[PDB]
Amino acid sequence: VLSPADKTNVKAAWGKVGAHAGEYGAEALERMFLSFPTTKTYFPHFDLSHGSAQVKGHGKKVADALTNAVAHVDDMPNALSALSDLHAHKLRVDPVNFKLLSHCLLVTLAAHLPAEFTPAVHASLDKFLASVSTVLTSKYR
Amino acid sequence: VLSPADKTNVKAAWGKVGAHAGEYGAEALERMFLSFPTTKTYFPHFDLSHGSAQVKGHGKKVADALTNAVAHVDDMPNALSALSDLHAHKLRVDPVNFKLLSHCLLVTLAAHLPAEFTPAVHASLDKFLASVSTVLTSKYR
Amino acid sequence: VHLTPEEKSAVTALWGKVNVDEVGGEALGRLLVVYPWTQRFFESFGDLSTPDAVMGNPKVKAHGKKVLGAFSDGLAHLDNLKGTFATLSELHCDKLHVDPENFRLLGNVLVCVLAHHFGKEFTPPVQAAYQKVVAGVANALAHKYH
Amino acid sequence: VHLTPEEKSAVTALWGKVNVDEVGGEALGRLLVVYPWTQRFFESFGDLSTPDAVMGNPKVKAHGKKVLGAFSDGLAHLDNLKGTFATLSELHCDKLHVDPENFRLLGNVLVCVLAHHFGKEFTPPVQAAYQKVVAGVANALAHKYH
Numbered sequence: 327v328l329s330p331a332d333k334t335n336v337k338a339a340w341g342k343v344g345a346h347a348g349e350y351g352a353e354a355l356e357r358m359f360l361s362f363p364t365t366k367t368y369f370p371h372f373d374l375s376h377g378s379a380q381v382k383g384h385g386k387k388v389a390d391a392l393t394n395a396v397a398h399v400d401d402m403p404n405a406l407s408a409l410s411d412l413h414a415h416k417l418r419v420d421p422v423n424f425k426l427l428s429h430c431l432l433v434t435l436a437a438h439l440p441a442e443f444t445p446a447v448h449a450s451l452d453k454f455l456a457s458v459s460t461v462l463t464s465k466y467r
Numbered sequence: 468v469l470s471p472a473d474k475t476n477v478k479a480a481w482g483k484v485g486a487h488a489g490e491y492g493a494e495a496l497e498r499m500f501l502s503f504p505t506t507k508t509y510f511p512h513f514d515l516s517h518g519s520a521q522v523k524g525h526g527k528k529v530a531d532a533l534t535n536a537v538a539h540v541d542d543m544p545n546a547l548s549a550l551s552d553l554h555a556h557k558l559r560v561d562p563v564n565f566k567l568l569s570h571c572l573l574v575t576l577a578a579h580l581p582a583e584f585t586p587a588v589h590a591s592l593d594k595f596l597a598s599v600s601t602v603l604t605s606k607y608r
Numbered sequence: 609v610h611l612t613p614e615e616k617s618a619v620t621a622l623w624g625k626v627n628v629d630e631v632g633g634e635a636l637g638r639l640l641v642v643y644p645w646t647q648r649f650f651e652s653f654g655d656l657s658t659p660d661a662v663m664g665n666p667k668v669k670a671h672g673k674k675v676l677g678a679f680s681d682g683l684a685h686l687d688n689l690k691g692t693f694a695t696l697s698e699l700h701c702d703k704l705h706v707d708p709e710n711f712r713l714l715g716n717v718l719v720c721v722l723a724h725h726f727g728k729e730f731t732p733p734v735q736a737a738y739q740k741v742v743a744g745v746a747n748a749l750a751h752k753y754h
Numbered sequence: 755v756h757l758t759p760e761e762k763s764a765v766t767a768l769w770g771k772v773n774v775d776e777v778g779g780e781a782l783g784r785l786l787v788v789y790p791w792t793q794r795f796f797e798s799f800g801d802l803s804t805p806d807a808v809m810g811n812p813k814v815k816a817h818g819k820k821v822l823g824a825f826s827d828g829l830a831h832l833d834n835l836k837g838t839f840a841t842l843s844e845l846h847c848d849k850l851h852v853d854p855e856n857f858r859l860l861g862n863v864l865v866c867v868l869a870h871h872f873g874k875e876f877t878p879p880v881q882a883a884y885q886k887v888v889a890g891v892a893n894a895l896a897h898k899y900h
């Protein structure tokens with residue numbers, strides 16, 4: 327699903343984010359419960375109020391799980407398997423919500439990396455995030 | 468993405484199908500043209516009346532394309548590279564129209580293989596077509 | 609929604625032979641196995657561990673009957689679907705939060721069931737009528753979002 | 755089709771800083787580029803076979819203008835998006851056969867082009883507000899399918 331060039335623009339953007347991931351995660355997250363509210367039922371305990379040390383340590387778990395993927399790009403199924411069973415069996419996240427987050431996650435990059443966010447990187451980032459989604463929502467039984 | 472239980476059930480279905488596939492593919496295309504008329508515009512140079520012999524051969528090209536992706540189940544992207552270009556690049560087919568023919572393939576199969584089309588197998592064929600569709604569409608530029 | 613006389617005939621025609629005590633359970637049941645995430649809205653129904661479990665469930669089949677009922681009902685009011693489901697759309701939207709793709713998904717699992725109980729009697733032109741039907745319902749149910 | 759005062763603000767305040775001439779082409783291209791099959795509708799536009807082939811394509815700009823145009827159009831008429839986009843609706847559906855999902859795509863690429871051009875200015879409180887409008891327009895556009 328991901329061609330040679332696609333993988334290139336990915337790393338291209340992980341880099342110029344590097345260790346900022348941990349934030350952009352939370353930032354991409356807060357953009358979500360703030361843009362599409364339905365997504366809130368998945369986090370019943372949480373305080374989705376701005377700044378939350380919850381939404382901040384979560385975005386790291388996220389952004390790092392992605393790095394793991396940008397790393398294991400030629401094989402995400404098995405490398406993301408631990409995560410695929412939290413979202414498909416335990417959490418039962420509606421595939422829809424992923425399209426939502428891959429979108430928020432994408433608006434963060436666009437507004438923190440105006441030089442890298444290029445029409446073709448933009449694209450490659452979608453296929454990437456799309457491919458991540460497909461893996462975390464695959465296992466359903 | 469596709470456990471052994473699935474790949475298992477797929478065959479017990481391809482099986483009862485037998486070279487009845489040719490006939491089934493065409494039936495799907497037919498169902499799709501009838502139930503989803505916009506998808507008829509991807510074939511302007513085709514006679515779309517009932518039993519129109521192109522559709523019969525085309526149904527066989529499609530079914531044989533499936534019978535092949537089942538064989539190379541664990542390696543579909545590669546095996547379908549030919550179509551990937553065709554559909555993704557040449558025809559520019561909306562990934563949505565794939566959901567339609569996959570639905571109209573499933574419906575066909577339920578219409579002729581009662582016993583084999585159990586919930587268990589239904590789920591599997593769906594995930595399977597869902598995939599072939601990603602492939603046949605994930606080559607875009 | 610917009611069915612032609614011929615079409616409108618085959619629907620109410622074929623419908624009349626549907627076992628209303630078992631089709632609801634099948635469609636609602638298969639929905640829960642083909643698109644597993646939809647199980648999350650039925651935690652309170654119990655066992656849904658395997659395809660057999662899910663299909664056996666008396667809550668699944670129970671509920672499934674209520675569902676087909678709403679469809680039954682819609683087939684009688686094809687010219688007022690948005691109203692027929694007015695409170696159902698509120699329910700599934702402001703109180704249950706079911707993303708709408710799922711209605712379109714249930715509607716198609718239903719079609720697959722008819723095709724199953726009606727072999728070749730479920731012909732392309734008939735399925736075509738239904739598609740117009742399940743789409744009307746799916747679209748009426750998601751109205752309190754529009 | 756109901757946004758709070760808070761929202762009404764940000765929306766009109768950042769759209770006033772929008773290069774009405776270039777964000778429209780910037781969007782329609784980012785569409786044909788991230789959602790490549792959307793090209794099949796612009797055959798008579800020539801070269802598109804490469805990100806920049808598209809990003810520089812002139813018709814791809816002349817058009818992205820009238821598009822980011824109707825947007826601004828609707829933005830004045832927030833409380834009757836159906837009216838505002840009636841004829842524009844029957845065109846893409848009744849005529850061109852543009853599957854309505856693609857509408858929620860162009861609106862989402864769009865929102866993305868904003869984040870780009872306005873950095874931290876485009877804040878979540880801003881996106882939310884805008885997210886609501888993009889959905890509006892898009893649902894608005896698809897009404898002749900409902």
Ligand code: HEM
Nearest residue numbers: 365368369387388391392409412417419423424427428458
């Ligand atoms: C880019 C896509 C996503 C990635 C990489 C991701 C990653 C993760 C990770 C690493 C965890 C922590 C797992 C653990 O503690 O063992 C997690 C938890 C969780 N995720 Fe996601 N996720 C994604 C999308 C989503 C979406 C779309 C939702 C739905 C809104 C969601 C809902 C949840 C929930 C409810 C938890 C458990 C939270 C808690 O109890 O603290 N995730 N995710």
Ligand code: HEM
Nearest residue numbers: 646649650674675678679704706710711714715745746749
């Ligand atoms: C378009 C096809 C559908 C129809 C006609 C339909 C109809 C109904 C009806 C008539 C009820 C009972 C309402 C009441 O008790 O007052 C109901 C309840 C419910 N439905 Fe649906 N539904 C449909 C699709 C779905 C889908 C796709 C889901 C999610 C996967 C869903 C989830 C639920 C849930 C969780 C309840 C809870 C009822 C309760 O225990 O309070 N429905 N539905």
Ligand code: HNI
Nearest residue numbers: 506509510528529532533550558560564565568599600603
């Ligand atoms: C409506 C859009 C559309 C969809 C959803 C679709 C979905 C699929 C699927 C998914 C299950 C499969 C396995 C498949 C397989 C095939 N298609 Ni599709 N095709 C579609 C539109 C076409 C068109 C158009 C052609 C060329 C037809 C012609 O001969 O003009 C085609 C040709 C083919 C061929 C012929 C290849 C060759 O020349 O040898 C195969 C095989 N296909 N198509």
Ligand code: HNI
Nearest residue numbers: 792795796820821824825842850852856857860861892895
């Ligand atoms: C990928 C398909 C596609 C999408 C998603 C899309 C989405 C949108 C959206 C937001 C969702 C808006 C506000 C919009 C607005 C417009 N489009 Ni779109 N258009 C699309 C394909 C077209 C095509 C093709 C035309 C040319 C129509 C013609 O005149 O032949 C067009 C023409 C227009 C015109 C000019 C009409 C005229 O001259 O009569 C406007 C205005 N549009 N389009």
